[PDB]
Design a binder for this molecule. Structure first.
Ligand code: BCL
Ligand code: BCL
Ligand code: BCL
Ligand code: BCL
Ligand code: BCL
Ligand code: BCL
Ligand code: BCL
Ligand SMILES: CCCCCC/C=C\CCCCCCCCCC(=O)O[C@H](COC(=O)CCCCCCCCCCCCCCC)COP(=O)(O)OC[C@@H](O)CO
Ligand SMILES: CC(C)=CCC/C(C)=C/C=C/C(C)=C/C=C/C(C)=C/C=C/C=C(C)/C=C/C=C(C)/C=C/C1=C(C)C(=O)CCC1(C)C
Ligand SMILES: CC(C)=CCC/C(C)=C/C=C/C(C)=C/C=C/C(C)=C/C=C/C=C(C)/C=C/C=C(C)/C=C/C1=C(C)C(=O)CCC1(C)C
Ligand SMILES: CC(C)=CCC/C(C)=C/C=C/C(C)=C/C=C/C(C)=C/C=C/C=C(C)/C=C/C=C(C)/C=C/C1=C(C)C(=O)CCC1(C)C
Ligand SMILES: [Fe+3]
Lengths: 38, 32, 49, 306, 49, 47, 302, 26, 38, 38, 38, 49, 49, 38, 35, 49, 38, 49, 38, 38, 49
């Protein structure tokens, strides 16, 4: 057992949430889409 | 008021020093 | 806890019940005074306009 | 497999010197230990010492050259004397005259060797006396900041002038000039992180020292023993901090906190300093685009004018 | 008639009252007389031209 | 236009989030360890 | 049995008086009510209970009044009155220097004064509550002494210096990222606060505090989970640097350097306001101390 | 009338001090 | 007993006092009433 | 029992109070209502 | 005793003194009265 | 607790009842004085206007 | 506790009663002096105006 | 026996001294009396 | 302690004497050391 | 404390009494010198004027 | 004794040296004497 | 402490008395030299004027 | 014994050396004597 | 023995070297001699 | 301490007395040289003028 499954779950879920937030914020600040008032 | 009040506040800053000085003197006196 | 109603016996001591009664009556008096104060302040200057 | 007497009292290289240990006396009364003890000289201490001596000698005799070789002007201006890096013209070049940054390059190279071999000394003596190498890696974080200041930020900016000028007043001047050149380091966010970690470093140091001196009567300071079984002093310390702020550490966790807060100071500082020149030329202007700058339409400027 | 017999009866404690009083008035006289001297001998800052 | 720049966000806010979150988690685990049961000197005796 | 240790290591019990004791037992053994400062003065501590893990004393209740009121006043001045909605752009400013030392509810800067007064009440109550809890546990008064150093740093910045200057607008604004604007404008008004000697001492002690913290965390972590004779770290610290301060010495130096940093710091900002207007002009005496006045030519004279 | 009043209050301080210190020093 | 009565009393009384002070100060600083020269 | 009832009560009550204060402050600062002299 | 009479006396007296001082200072700083040259 | 009425015997000691009586009478006197002071200050300068 | 009136016997010791008498008389004298001082300061400079 | 006479004496005397100092300092700083400068 | 009072009084007196001398000399009021 | 008067025996050691005598005589001599210095400085330049 | 003789000697000698240096420097800098070309 | 007079025996060791004698004689010689220096500097340039 | 002879020797010798250096410096910087082109 | 001979040797030799360097540097910087183009 | 005079035996070791003699003679020689140097520097350029 190289990795506890709970550890991989925590790390993957936190990475996914952080990346979703980061990508949403980058896309919204880019003004490239016209989403939420251009 | 400028210099009297200013020096009273200065002395409060040094009073703030005082507790630490008491700590150092405590260590010295109680380690004989 | 004899003075406490058996509904509230698991929660209230004998002495805590009297102090609770004082607190309740004080809160009620303060509420009446607060309602009067709000009606007076509204008749004086309405804050909602 | 480790002789503690042999590691203190071997002779020569890979041995110690000053081996008959002196006693300072006031250090024993105030700090509890007064033995200066033998100091190790282990082929990394020698490189460290002689390369630092070369660095300091270059700097000191260039101080002497700058005062026209006058040993009073030397003593008068010693704190504002400095050996500055080569100017921005011919910025990364080492073909700079000795007075215009030539002495700075040699002294800084020898200082680099000195700090690297001091790291090696920390590492090798930690392994030789049986303790972990945590101090060597803490020094490595400090050295990350140091090598950004002196080697990695001057490079990637294109000039040695981006580095400090080897003087008592020159480092203060360097800090001022670097914050001024890149906008306002107050709006450097990794500078803010590094200040968070530095002030938290001092806060944890003060809290830890005060807690252990307060629970000193029950021998809380003997952390090595307390990490095997927590005595009454450590119990009182844990309870103090639980009742004050609702959570506490034991004899072992608090030093993890200490190590990591200091390491984060150094690391976030290195990152912020390297970012200021290369990626974000202006921190206040970046802070306005980052919406972290407070609008100040009508400031009261009577406070700031005499 | 006292409640602090270790402070008002015993000579060491009784003395502490006088000691504290004298030290307070000594410090106050220190500060007051310094500022008096300083303000009486120091000239007024020269009138602006 | 109301939005800070990507740079601003990355730098300030996800390190802000990391510091706050990580501090809270480190405190959680600090105290889980500190309040767990391990070898202590019994207070009734040693004291 | 596994025998779990404070570090987190499980050592198999043979390879001391210690037993595996629950914290709940440690916590209930050391409660000891009624030793607090308030219980000496009034004969009883009005709040001698614990709310959860926290100890609520008289000064804990005062401190929590201060905390709640300070947070709410802070957020009133900056959500309302400023309209910002984001805490990095809000600007909790004292009354203008024009107003002087007097406070006016109608004039702007009134909620800064309230936030500052409630924050002072909160900080002093926190300090007095630390005294409470150290008195309960028969500890020394060192943690209150260090926290008092930093609380006096706050008192100097918001009470002593604004009073001595006389304008109450010399207190720093309570804004995230904007108190930095005050720190920068005060640092440059008395230009080169680097040349402020009590400021240089404060920075020296801050850097030394972080260095000592790293060295101590290193030293204790390096000997943590090893078969060591407790003298290995001393030999290491004598092989490196030729001096080992000892277990009690490093914590004393920790406490002292920590406190002294902010003590010299508040001496610096107070002097910077009131007695010294220019910190480069301060050092004008040095080249004129009469032992080196005469010896120089060209640019090498002063 | 301010000098009058300051003198008045200092002498009341002093006489109060003589009275209760006389009791304490009894 | 989930909640000591003394704890609830302390918390409620302190919350009420803090809220009364906060609301008084907000209303007085608003200058919306002409109270104490507003 | 996953959650002590006292813990849930404390958390919910504090969250509700904080949210009421936050929403009141946001609505009052918005100037959208003409309440307390707009 | 959860409700000692001495505790209630201390708390009430301290609250009254603090409130008297606070109200005096608020009223004096308001400049609404012309008391002590206002 | 004999001097205490039985309703308040669970709460008040014998000595605490006398001190409570003093506190109550002091609060009442202070309230009368406070009402008089408020009426006088209103007749002098109304703060509500 | 013989010197104490039986009304205040639950509260006052024999020695505490004499010290309480001293405190009461001191408070009364200080009150008279404070009233005189306030009348004098008002005749000098009215603070309420 | 509740309320030791010594305790009441200490508390009352300290409160009176603190209040006298506070009132003197408030009156002197107000400049209605002008720190006695007149 | 008598030693404490002696140290405090002597240091206060010396500091006071130095302060008053320096205030009087800097005032340029008395004709001392070409003032 | 043999050489100390019995009035001051609770306060003064045997050696502390001699050092106190030296301190008292030094303070008196310094006071005489200070009075002379003040009279001379007044005859020279009155600071009150 | 209240004071070690060595302590009094150190303090007195250091005070005398510091005062001699201070007075010499004040007198020299005053330019009131014409000493060392003044 | 035989060489010490019995008045100062509580304060002075045997060796401390000889060093105190040296210090006293040095202070006296320095005082004579200081008086001579002050008279000479006054005859040269009076500082009080 | 109030004073080790070695301590007095060290202190006196260091004081004499420091004073000789200080006086030489002061005299040389004064330019009041033609010593070393002055 | 008040003074180890090794200590006196170290101190005297270091003092002599420091003084020789200091005097050489003072004399060379004075430009009073015409040595090394002075 | 045989070589030391019995007056200074409480203070001086046997070896410390010889080193003290060297120090005294060195101080005297240095004093003579200093007096000569001061007379020469005065004859050259008087600093008091
Ligand atoms: C984020 C990580 C999640 C997780 C998410 C998944 C997902 C999702 C799956 C598994 C599945 C598996 N996981 Mg899992 N898994 C987790 C934690 C664990 C842990 C752990 C240490 O405890 C273990 C031991 C496992 C073990 C396993 C096996 C039970 C199983 C088969 C994997 C395999 O054979 O790979 C062999 C196959 C590969 C390695 C293919 C590699 C694919 C690469 C990336 C190419 C993808 C092509 C892409 C789809 C096309 C892109 C086109 C775009 C649309 C344009 N998981 C963590 C929590 N796991 C698989 C499953 O169970 O099947 C039902 C699967 O579907
Ligand atoms: C608008 C188009 C923008 C863009 C904007 C975004 C945004 C915005 C996002 C991504 C995200 C992603 N994009 Mg993109 N993306 C673009 C261009 C690209 C390109 C390409 C070269 O052009 C690529 C390869 C990608 C690739 C990707 C992957 C990294 C990711 C989506 C799959 C993934 O792994 O997460 C798959 C996600 C999941 C498996 C999470 C599932 C979570 C579940 C469904 C819960 C969702 C939250 C839910 C509301 C909570 C409810 C709980 C209640 C209790 C019930 N993007 C362009 C520029 N991209 C998404 C991401 O997640 O980043 C990690 C995202 O946030
Ligand atoms: C004026 C209209 C403003 C607005 C201003 C406010 C304000 C102002 C508030 C809310 C609050 C809320 N609003 Mg809104 N709200 C608006 C638009 C919306 C919209 C919508 C999309 O348009 C929605 C969905 C909501 C939704 C909500 C809920 C989050 C909440 C009300 C129910 C709740 O859960 O708490 C229900 C509340 C309770 C269950 C608490 C019960 C407490 C008891 C009654 C005690 C009350 C205190 C009492 C005085 C103490 C006495 C004690 C004495 C000792 C006796 N608002 C518009 C913009 N909204 C309220 C809230 O509480 O936020 C959490 C509130 O404070
Ligand atoms: C001038 C008019 C000002 C104003 C200025 C003040 C001032 C000033 C004060 C108050 C105080 C109060 N005011 Mg207001 N007040 C105003 C407008 C209002 C309004 C209104 C909506 O308009 C209201 C409801 C109130 C309400 C109140 C109560 C909170 C309180 C008076 C009763 C009380 O509980 O304490 C009753 C007080 C007592 C029971 C204490 C009794 C103490 C005893 C008598 C001892 C007194 C001290 C004595 C000198 C010590 C002697 C000891 C010696 C040893 C013998 N004010 C206007 C704006 N208000 C008073 C207060 O106490 O605040 C708590 C006070 O200090
Ligand atoms: C020129 C006139 C200047 C002035 C310049 C000075 C100077 C310059 C000095 C004083 C010093 C003093 N002056 Mg003045 N003084 C003036 C006006 C005054 C007036 C007055 C109101 O007018 C007064 C009261 C004084 C008062 C004093 C005393 C504080 C003191 C002299 C006695 C003393 O205690 O130390 C007595 C000193 C001794 C007991 C020390 C004895 C030391 C022994 C002799 C060793 C001397 C060093 C020796 C060279 C080392 C050799 C060691 C080798 C190994 C052998 N001055 C005028 C303005 N004054 C002197 C002083 O010492 O200050 C403390 C001094 O330095
Ligand atoms: C040129 C005239 C200048 C002046 C310039 C100097 C200079 C320059 C010096 C003094 C020094 C002194 N001057 Mg002056 N001095 C002046 C005016 C004065 C006046 C006066 C009111 O006018 C006075 C009272 C003094 C008083 C003094 C004494 C403080 C001292 C000389 C005696 C002493 O104690 O040290 C006596 C010194 C000794 C006992 C040391 C003996 C050391 C032995 C001889 C070794 C010498 C070093 C030797 C080379 C090392 C060889 C070692 C090898 C291994 C063999 N000066 C005028 C302004 N004065 C001298 C001093 O030493 O200051 C402490 C000195 O340096
Ligand atoms: C050019 C004239 C300049 C001047 C420039 C210098 C210079 C330059 C020096 C002195 C030094 C000295 N001068 Mg001068 N000096 C001047 C005016 C004066 C006057 C005077 C009032 O006018 C005086 C009293 C002095 C007094 C002195 C003494 C302090 C000293 C010489 C004797 C001494 O003690 O060291 C005697 C020295 C020794 C005993 C050291 C012996 C060392 C042995 C010989 C080794 C020498 C090094 C050798 C090369 C190493 C070889 C090792 C190999 C392994 C073999 N100078 C004028 C202004 N003076 C010299 C000194 O040493 O300062 C301490 C020196 O450096
Ligand atoms: C104002 C609000 C502050 C009050 C918020 C806390 C309220 C009291 C919480 C008490 C509960 C408690 O003590 O919280 C503990 C966590 O604390 C913790 O560090 C929580 C630390 C909370 C940090 C609050 C930050 C203050 C913010 C001020 C500045 C903005 C966990 O508690 P238990 O394991 O349950 O042990 C108590 C049990 O015996 C009772 O069941
Ligand atoms: C513009 C923007 C930003 C808008 C943001 C939009 C969003 C995100 C809104 C989010 C809203 C949310 C999440 C609101 C939350 C509301 C809550 C949790 C209310 C709690 C009520 C809790 C209550 C009533 C608790 C009551 C507690 C009581 C009655 C205590 C009871 C008692 C206890 C427990 C005792 O022992 C004894 C005393 C007593 C019996 C009184
Ligand atoms: C514009 C703005 C800022 C408006 C603010 C609006 C708000 C929020 C107002 C808030 C008002 C509130 C909350 C006021 C609070 C009033 C109270 C609690 C008064 C207490 C009285 C307690 C009193 C008099 C206590 C008296 C105690 C006494 C006499 C004690 C006596 C004694 C006791 C018992 C002893 O040991 C033994 C005997 C002795 C006499 C010494
Ligand atoms: C602005 C201006 C002008 C200000 C100025 C105004 C003032 C305040 C002037 C101050 C004057 C003062 C204070 C002068 C002080 C002069 C002193 C202390 C000289 C010391 C001599 C010490 C001497 C000679 C020590 C010699 C030591 C020796 C010979 C050592 C000998 C030796 C030792 C000890 C050994 O191991 C073994 C034997 C060996 C011989 C080698
Ligand atoms: Fe530690």
């Amino acid at each position: 057992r190289p990795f506890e499954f709970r550890t991989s779950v925590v790390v993957s879920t936190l990475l996914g949430l952080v990346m979703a937030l980061l990508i949403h914020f980058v896309v919204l600040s880019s003004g490239a889409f016209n989403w939420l008032r251009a | 008021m400028n210099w009297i009040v200013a020096t009273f506040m200065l002395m409060f800053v040094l009073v703030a020093f005082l507790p630490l000085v008491v700590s150092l003197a405590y260590t010295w006196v109680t380690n004989p | 806890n004899d003075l406490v109603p058996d509904q509230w016996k698991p929660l209230f001591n004998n002495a805590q019940w009297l102090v609770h009664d004082i607190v309740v009556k004080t809160i009620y008096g303060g509420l009446i005074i607060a309602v009067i104060a709000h009606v007076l302040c509204w008749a004086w200057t309405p804050w909602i306009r | 497999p480790i002789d503690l007497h042999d590691e203190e009292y071997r002779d020569g290289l890979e041995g110690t010197i000053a081996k008959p240990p002196g006693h300072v006396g006031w250090m024993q009364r105030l700090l509890g230990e007064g033995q200066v003890g033998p100091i190790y000289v282990g082929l990394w201490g020698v490189i460290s010492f002689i390369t630092f001596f070369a660095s300091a000698f270059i700097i000191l005799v260039d101080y002497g050259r700058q005062v026209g070789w006058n040993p009073i002007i030397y003593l008068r201006e010693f704190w504002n004397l400095a050996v500055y890096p080569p100017p921005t013209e011919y910025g990364l070049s080492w073909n700079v005259p000795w007075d215009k940054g030539g002495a700075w390059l040699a002294a800084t190279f020898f200082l680099h060797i000195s700090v690297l071999t001091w790291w090696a000394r920390l590492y090798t003596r930690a392994k030789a006396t049986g303790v972990g190498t945590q101090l060597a890696w803490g020094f490595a974080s400090a050295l990350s900041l140091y090598f950004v200041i002196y080697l990695f930020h001057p490079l990637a900016l294109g000039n040695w002038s981006a580095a400090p000028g080897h003087g008592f007043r020159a480092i203060l001047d360097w800090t001022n000039y670097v914050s001024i050149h890149w906008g306002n380091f107050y709006y450097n966010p990794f500078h803010m992180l590094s200040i968070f970690f530095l002030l938290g470093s001092t806060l944890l140091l003060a809290m830890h020292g005060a807690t252990i001196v307060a629970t000193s009567k029950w021998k809380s300071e003997m952390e090595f023993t307390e990490m095997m079984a927590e005595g009454p002093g450590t119990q009182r310390a844990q309870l103090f901090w639980r009742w004050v702020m609702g959570w506490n550490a034991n004899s072992y966790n608090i030093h993890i906190w200490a190590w990591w807060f200091a390491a984060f100071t150094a690391i976030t500082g290195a990152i912020g300093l390297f970012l200021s020149g290369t990626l974000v030329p202006d921190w206040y202007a970046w802070g306005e685009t980052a919406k972290i700058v407070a609008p100040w339409p009508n400031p009261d400027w009577a406070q700031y004018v005499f | 008639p006292t409640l602090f017999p270790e402070i008002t009866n015993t000579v060491r404690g009784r003395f502490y009252i006088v000691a504290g009083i004298i030290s307070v008035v000594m410090a106050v006289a220190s500060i007051a007389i310094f500022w008096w001297i300083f303000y009486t001998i120091t000239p007024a800052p020269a009138p602006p031209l | 236009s109301p939005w800070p720049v990507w740079s601003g966000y990355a730098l300030c806010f996800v390190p802000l989030a990391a510091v706050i979150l990580g501090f809270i988690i480190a405190a959680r685990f600090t105290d889980k360890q500190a309040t767990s049961a391990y070898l202590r000197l019994d207070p009734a005796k040693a004291n | 049995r596994a025998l779990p240790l404070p570090s987190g290591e499980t050592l198999p019990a043979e390879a001391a008086s210690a037993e595996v004791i629950p914290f709940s037992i440690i916590e209930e053994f050391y409660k000891r009510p009624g030793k607090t400062l308030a219980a000496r003065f009034f004969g009883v501590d009005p709040f001698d209970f614990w709310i959860g893990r926290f100890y609520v004393g008289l000064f804990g209740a005062i401190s929590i009044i201060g905390i709640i009121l300070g947070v709410a006043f802070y957020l009133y001045e900056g959500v309302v009155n400023e309209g910002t909605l984001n805490i990095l752009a809000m600007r909790i400013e004292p009354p203008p220097v024009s107003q002087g030392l007097n406070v006016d509810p109608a004039q702007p800067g009134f909620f800064w004064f309230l936030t500052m007064v409630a924050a002072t009440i909160a900080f002093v109550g926190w300090l007095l509550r630390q005294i409470d809890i150290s008195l309960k546990l028969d500890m020394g008064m060192e943690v209150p002494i260090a926290f008092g150093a930093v609380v006096s740093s706050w008192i100097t910045l918001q009470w002593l210096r604004p009073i001595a200057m006389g304008a109450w607008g010399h207190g720093f604004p309570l804004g995230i990222t904007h108190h930095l604007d005050w720190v920068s404008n005060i640092g440059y008004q008395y230009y080169n606060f680097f040349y402020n000697p009590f400021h240089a001492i404060g920075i020296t002690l801050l850097f030394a505090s972080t260095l000592f913290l790293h060295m101590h965390g290193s030293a204790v972590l390096s000997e943590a989970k090893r078969n060591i004779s407790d003298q290995n770290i001393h030999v290491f610290w004598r092989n490196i640097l030729g001096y080992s301060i000892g277990e009690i010495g490093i914590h004393r130096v920790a406490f002292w350097t920590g406190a002294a940093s902010v003590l010299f710091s508040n001496l610096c900002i107070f002097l910077s306001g009131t007695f010294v207007k220019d910190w480069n002009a301060f050092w004008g005496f040095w080249d004129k101390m009469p032992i080196w006045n005469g010896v120089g030519q060209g640019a090498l004279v002063a | 009338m301010a000098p009058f009043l300051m003198a008045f209050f200092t002498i009341v301080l002093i006489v109060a001090t003589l009275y209760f210190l006389s009791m304490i020093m009894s």
